[PDB]
Amino acid sequence: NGLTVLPPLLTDEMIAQYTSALLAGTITSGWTFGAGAALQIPFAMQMAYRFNGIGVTQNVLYENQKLIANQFNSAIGKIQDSLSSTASALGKLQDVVN
């Protein structure tokens, strides 16, 4: 009946090549790769420059580093198990298609 659905300009394999270059700059450069030439900086030493932006001083981080790592990792794991659950929170995305 003449109803056509065209394919997008950006394939689903090119999107993954942006959102993996937006995620290897944050890890290794920080807030700098989006404001000029990216400048590397050790990851720990940038998280402590993000604590120092919300009030807590750096000695809080450098003396609780292991606990912070072992909390962030657990949070990531729980997120992965959360998305895989039913009644998915991605109901916003499948509402558009419906």
Add this chain to the structure above:
Amino acid sequence: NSIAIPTNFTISVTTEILPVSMTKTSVDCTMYICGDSTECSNLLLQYGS
């Protein structure tokens, strides 16, 4: 004169889903209004743009 100072923190990861685009559709007006009928194409032609 009573304050409450936190003593231990908790790093939490949330999630947020946002729509960005939707399927790019396109309909062929003549082929739908009356398709494969040359006897109707002329009639539709005069009906406007």
Add this chain to the structure above:
Amino acid sequence: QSLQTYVTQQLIRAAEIRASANLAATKMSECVLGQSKRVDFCGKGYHLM
């Protein structure tokens, strides 16, 4: 008339998607390419990254 109604619905829904794809761009530009100080914008709590 049915085709016109469908086109109008698509126009309005595309306006909604346009509105919700300029908030995702903002959240990507601020919550990701930096650090936010806007309360309860990049998730509940003080935003780290």
Add this chain to the structure above:
Amino acid sequence: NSIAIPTNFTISVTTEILPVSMTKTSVDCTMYICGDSTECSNLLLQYGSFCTQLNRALTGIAVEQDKNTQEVFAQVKQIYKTPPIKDFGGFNFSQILPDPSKPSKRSFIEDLLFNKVTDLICAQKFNGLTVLPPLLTDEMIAQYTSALLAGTITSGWTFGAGAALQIPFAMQMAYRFNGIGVTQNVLYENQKLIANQFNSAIGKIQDSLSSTASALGKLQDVVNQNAQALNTLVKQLSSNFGAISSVLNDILSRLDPPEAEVQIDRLITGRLQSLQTYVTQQLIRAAEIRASANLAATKMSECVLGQSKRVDFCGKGYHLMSFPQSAPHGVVFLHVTYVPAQEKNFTTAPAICHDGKAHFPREGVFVSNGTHWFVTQRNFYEPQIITTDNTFVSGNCDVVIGIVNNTVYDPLQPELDS
């Protein structure tokens, strides 16, 4: 343990064009559906009150079009005039402040926009299609965006938050560096270079707008769209909608009322549908313009009436300041931004251990040239000596990973010795 500290900066001017309003149209429903035909006016009268709905909608649109320009520009409660001075620490503002030579108050960049953005219109007039003039003329807009530009220069972030307070221009740019991390001594010792970079950036912008493939294609897209939809509304008077003919006088002079009416009605139902479609398109496009004229107001309220800390909002780079300029049915922003350059690898360390206790930086990072250790601010290489002044002791140097054995010099003990 490898950091990269910029050593030389670059002040860059961007541009951003935003639509603000669109032409205020108005159609006379009766004069268009069947004009100059009293034999059809009575027939249309009984057809309902569509004729007034499709005039109230186009009135609401033409009202919010007048409101958008009030919202975007009318943010100053007074009209500042820049004093006749040039002592702007070497900064040159000729290309943006209004000139005395030209009869109007149009600045040297606002005119490059007017001479870049560009019968049938009479036929639209004969068919009841009117285009009203805006409430704010194009000579009053220039009297706001030249009072929004002589307050930023001479008052700063204060004229939009109470009574304007003057402050030397140099001494305010240094209070905008001090908002993005770089200390003031960076500015006051690089003042000439900063002036001679900002001026060059302005010149290159002026040459950039004058180029072809103009970036102002956003502003001339609005006009093209609103002049293309209205041309179809006139093209569609040539379609007969299945009636005998498309000229109403033909039908009136070939058929008696009993049979004339049953044809006029398939005309009156053909033109009214077209008019409703046009009104709906105008409503939706006006919603888009309303959305894009409340982002221009925000950018004017934040990027201009202050300084922004929202990344990649007021132009790429760290945002220093901005300047508004008018444009036909639109606003132009010149974001002046600070961009680092010429990185240089260094070896770093989290915390330094002097007497077993771990010293930490107060503002900056630790940087070594391979033999000596200094502490430097993070957006410019300005090494200092690691003293007990700019490092705050915390805890014992056994818990932090990456601590470096070194020496910290106290200012008290050596000078006290005598």
Add this chain to the structure above:
Amino acid sequence: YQDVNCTEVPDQLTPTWRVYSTGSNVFQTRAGCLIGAEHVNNSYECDIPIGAGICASYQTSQSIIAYTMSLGAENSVAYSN
């Protein structure tokens, strides 16, 4: 009368409207010919917006006045170095 040069305001259809088709209050703007208003040399933040920078309002023993809308007061910050 929107976008009508003032000469064309006639013909003499009804005199109650011919009163508003002539007189000494006939005024010309960039939006057309406005009749029934007094053109003053003041300036105000305007109440009823005619268009093209002209606005009308009711005031003094009173009548309708059509003036040029005022943007605001003057100021000149004493900028020294």
